[PDB]
């Protein structure tokens, strides 16, 4: 849902004739964890990472 999110609201907000004061381009610094995990049992979780 992040891609539609940036598609409909974020991109019009960052650039355009409105909301001119920006003061710098955005970033997408993401972290990896190096430890690709299989999907967890769906439903109520133990709430512990």
């Amino acid at each position: 849902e992040l891609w539609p999110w940036m598609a409909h609201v974020l991109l019009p907000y960052v650039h355009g004739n409105q909301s001119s004061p920006e003061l710098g381009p955005p970033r997408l610094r993401q972290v990896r964890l190096q430890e690709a995990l299989y999907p967890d049992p769906p439903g109520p979780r133990v709430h512990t990472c």
Partner: protein, 49 residues
């Protein structure tokens, strides 16, 4: 790992498509951390988003 999201609409959307169809946020992908900035000249305040 960080991206720059471009500077104009066309380049921003092109970069988004390019990284989406080349398996960027498809793996383990712990977190994304989108954060940019803002400035407000009427009052003289900033905001870290």
């Amino acid at each position: 790992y960080v991206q720059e999201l471009g500077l104009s609409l066309e380049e921003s959307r092109d970069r988004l498509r390019f990284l989406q169809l080349h398996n960027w946020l498809d793996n383990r992908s712990r977190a994304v951390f989108l954060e940019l900035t803002r400035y407000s000249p009427a009052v003289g305040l900033h905001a870290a988003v």
